[PDB]
Write an enzyme that holds these catalytic residues in place. Structure first.
Site, PDB file in Angstrom:
ATOM      1  CG  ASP A  87      -0.549   0.045   2.522  1.00  0.00           C
ATOM      2  OD1 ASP A  87       0.669   0.051   2.769  1.00  0.00           O
ATOM      3  OD2 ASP A  87      -1.412   0.085   3.444  1.00  0.00           O
ATOM      4  CG  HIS A 148       1.977  -0.462  10.092  1.00  0.00           C
ATOM      5  ND1 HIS A 148       0.811  -1.188  10.021  1.00  0.00           N
ATOM      6  CD2 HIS A 148       2.583  -0.600   8.890  1.00  0.00           C
ATOM      7  CE1 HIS A 148       0.732  -1.777   8.840  1.00  0.00           C
ATOM      8  NE2 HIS A 148       1.784  -1.417   8.125  1.00  0.00           N
ATOM      9  CG  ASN A 179      -0.358  -6.736   8.247  1.00  0.00           C
ATOM     10  OD1 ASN A 179      -0.234  -7.760   8.929  1.00  0.00           O
ATOM     11  ND2 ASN A 179       0.567  -6.340   7.377  1.00  0.00           N
TER      12      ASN A 179
HETATM   13 ZN    ZN Z   1       2.136  -1.782   6.187  1.00  0.00          ZN
HETATM   14 ZN    ZN Z   2      -1.672   0.014   5.532  1.00  0.00          ZN
END
Ligand code: ZN
Ligand code: ZN
Ligand code: QZH
Ligand code: CL
Ligand code: CL
Ligand code: MG
Ligand code: NA
Ligand code: ZN
Length: 231
Positions: A87, A148, A179
């Site tokens: 992404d 993240h 995630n």
């Molecule tokens: Zn990521």
């Molecule tokens: Zn993401």
């Protein structure tokens, strides 16, 4: 007016003007059997544009470039990917083919290579240690520490007081973790604390996915990350 996941067909890209010379770009993608929106940023850089993050895939990123030309009409000359996942780098090859100079930190470039994702051409120096910040055209790039992902960067636009958190910051409607396979859950709250201490003047905060808000998105994200750690 901010577009949501149900108002963007996969394959289309919408732009949203946040402030003078600052837009977000919004696209959608199928993943894990669901459809998710994703944001990036566009920042005016004189008579050129700086892009933050791809539109999550080659087709989406080609649509992104077309929408920028149609709506804004200035050339995208540089792009920064804020971590190594698809992404953020998926579509880097489209950008490169279109003459955009693509950038990421050395740590992001290496992780992208290990993962098999597309690799931005240029390296961003000065971001290898938690708390490091560098100016890059009209933005400041900040490495808050692992969150993240271990390489995640955030982006501040000083002239507009816009903080773009990428996937390290969650939208308010996300009340459970996303995630986290590559996350440092234990460091994520501390990294958010660094963002809060370094950008307390931010007025708009853009998460990696979903609706913008204010600085309350930072505490919200810590709350969600901590709840996931304890579950
Ligand atoms: Zn990521
Ligand atoms: Zn993401
Ligand atoms: C595909 C890759 O780019 C992903 C990543 O960057 O981790 C995307 N990002 C998130 C996020 O939580 O930010 C996702 C959450 C839905 C799946 C659970 S899909
Ligand atoms: Cl180049
Ligand atoms: Cl170049
Ligand atoms: Mg580095
Ligand atoms: Na990925
Ligand atoms: Zn170059």
């Amino acid at each position: 007016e901010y577009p949501t996941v149900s108002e963007i067909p996969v394959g289309e890209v919408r732009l949203y003007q946040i402030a003078d010379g600052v837009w977000s770009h919004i696209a959608t993608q199928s993943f894990d059997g669901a459809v998710y929106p994703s944001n990036g940023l566009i920042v005016r850089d004189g008579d050129e544009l700086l892009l933050i993050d791809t539109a999550w895939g080659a087709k989406n990123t080609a649509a992104l470039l077309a929408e920028i030309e149609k709506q804004i009409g200035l050339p995208v000359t540089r792009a920064v990917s804020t971590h190594f996942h698809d992404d953020r780098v998926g579509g880097v090859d489209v950008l490169r083919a279109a003459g955009v100079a693509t950038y990421a930190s050395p740590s992001t470039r290496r992780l992208a290579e290990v993962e098999g994702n597309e690799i931005p051409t240029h390296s961003l120096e000065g971001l290898s240690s938690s708390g490091d910040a560098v100016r890059f055209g009209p933005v400041e790039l900040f490495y808050p520490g692992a969150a993240h992902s271990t390489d995640n960067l955030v982006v501040y636009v000083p002239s507009a007081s816009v903080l773009y958190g990428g996937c390290a910051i969650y939208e308010l409607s996300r009340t459970s973790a996303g995630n986290v396979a590559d996350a440092d859950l234990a460091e994520w709250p501390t990294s958010i604390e660094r963002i809060q201490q370094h950008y307390p003047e931010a007025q708009f905060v853009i998460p990696g996915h979903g609706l913008p808000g204010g600085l309350d998105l930072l505490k919200h994200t810590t709350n969600v990350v901590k709840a996931h750690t304890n579950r």
